[PDB]
Design a protein around this nucleic acid. Structure first.
Ligand SMILES: [Mn+2]
Ligand SMILES: [Mn+2]
Ligand SMILES: [Mn+2]
Length: 327
DNA sequence: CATTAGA
DNA sequence: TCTAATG
């Protein structure tokens, strides 16, 4: 957590690079398991040799650790950090729509900067187009204050279109966070669950709503179950407009909400841990259900849920307010 | 780890 | 169809 820090971070830098600037899936995969194990080991690695004892630790990375231990740095690391191309790739990457594949291609074409991308708006797609559009506000955090404002309007039309809806705005917001990166809207409807062969419109009706009122402003992607967009809060009585916000709305079978709710609400750890416990408790939890375990090794059969509580009662735990689902 | 775009 | 990019 800290006695093995420099090593871990260095490695992951090492790993993140192979994946991105290069295509080295494997090396990258390499640096990761290593960067993983070395993180677990309870003592101060004092030499590669020592590291090397480890699993996934080869001559390659161990060599790497000596150098880092020996001298406060690493050239390979220093070289990359300098490398304009590779820099370039990391950069373009921030552009929502942009991935490594693109990055690279873009770079090869010579598009390396913000401006580059502009000049060639043609070379980019709608997503990427949008991404480029709202790059600044896309990297901006969302104050709860706003979060509050957003969730309000949203439940608002949700309600309006059909009173039979259920929306929850999950994530850290849901968890109390003083700020969020985007807004995550979970959605369901009685008239939609497991078997009841859809009602795409169900999703459809809302986005449309939000749009008509100006909440929704662009479309990153619209599917019959997962919309992905951009939104904004009505820029008040002037002098202050709002940044373009990333938002996601998703449809869900009323029969699997709460799990998914539970889940997407986190925290990553809270979940893992709760889930771990459900294992002892003779259960199985996952993004959609909760199945009781059969000693044969495994089992099935989706226990019925109607609330965040049921899942809890099931594994006989303490209801944790989402406030404190921190871990 | 599944959904969406796209080419 | 595949492949990329999001989460
Ligand atoms: Mn070994
Ligand atoms: Mn990006
Ligand atoms: Mn998200």
């Amino acid at each position: 957590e800290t006695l093995n820090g420099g090593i871990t971070d260095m490695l992951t830098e090492l790993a993140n690079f192979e994946k991105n600037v290069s295509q080295a899936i494997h090396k990258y995969n390499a640096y990761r398991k290593a960067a993983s194990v070395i993180a677990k080991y309870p003592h101060k690695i004092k030499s590669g040799a020592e590291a090397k004892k480890l699993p996934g630790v080869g001559t390659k990375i161990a060599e790497k650790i000596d150098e880092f231990l020996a001298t406060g740095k690493l050239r390979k690391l220093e070289k990359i950090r300098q490398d304009d191309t590779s820099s370039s790739i990391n950069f373009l990457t921030r552009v929502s729509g942009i991935g490594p594949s693109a990055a690279r291609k873009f770079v090869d074409e010579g598009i390396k900067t913000l401006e580059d991308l502009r000049k060639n708006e043609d070379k980019l797609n709608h997503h990427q187009r949008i991404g480029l559009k709202y790059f600044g506000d896309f990297e901006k955090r969302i104050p709860r204050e706003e979060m509050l404002q957003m969730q309000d309007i949203v439940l608002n039309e949700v309600k309006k279109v059909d009173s039979e809806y259920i929306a929850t705005v999950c994530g850290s917001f849901r968890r109390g966070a003083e700020s969020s990166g985007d807004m995550d809207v979970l959605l369901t409807h009685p008239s939609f669950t497991s078997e009841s062969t859809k009602q795409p419109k169900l999703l459809h009706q809302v986005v449309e709503q939000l749009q008509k009122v100006h909440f929704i402003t662009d479309t990153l992607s619209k599917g019959e179950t997962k919309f992905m967009g951009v939104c904004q809060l009505p820029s008040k009585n002037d002098e202050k407009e709002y940044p373009h916000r990333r938002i996601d709305i998703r449809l869900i079978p009323k029969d699997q909400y709460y799990c998914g709710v539970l889940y997407f609400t986190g925290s990553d750890i809270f979940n893992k841990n709760m889930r771990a416990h459900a294992l002892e408790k003779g259960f199985t939890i996952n993004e959609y259900t909760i199945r009781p375990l059969g000693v044969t090794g495994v089992a099935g059969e989706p226990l019925p849920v109607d609330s965040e509580k049921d899942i809890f009662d099931y594994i006989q735990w303490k209801y944790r307010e989402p406030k404190d689902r921190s871990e």
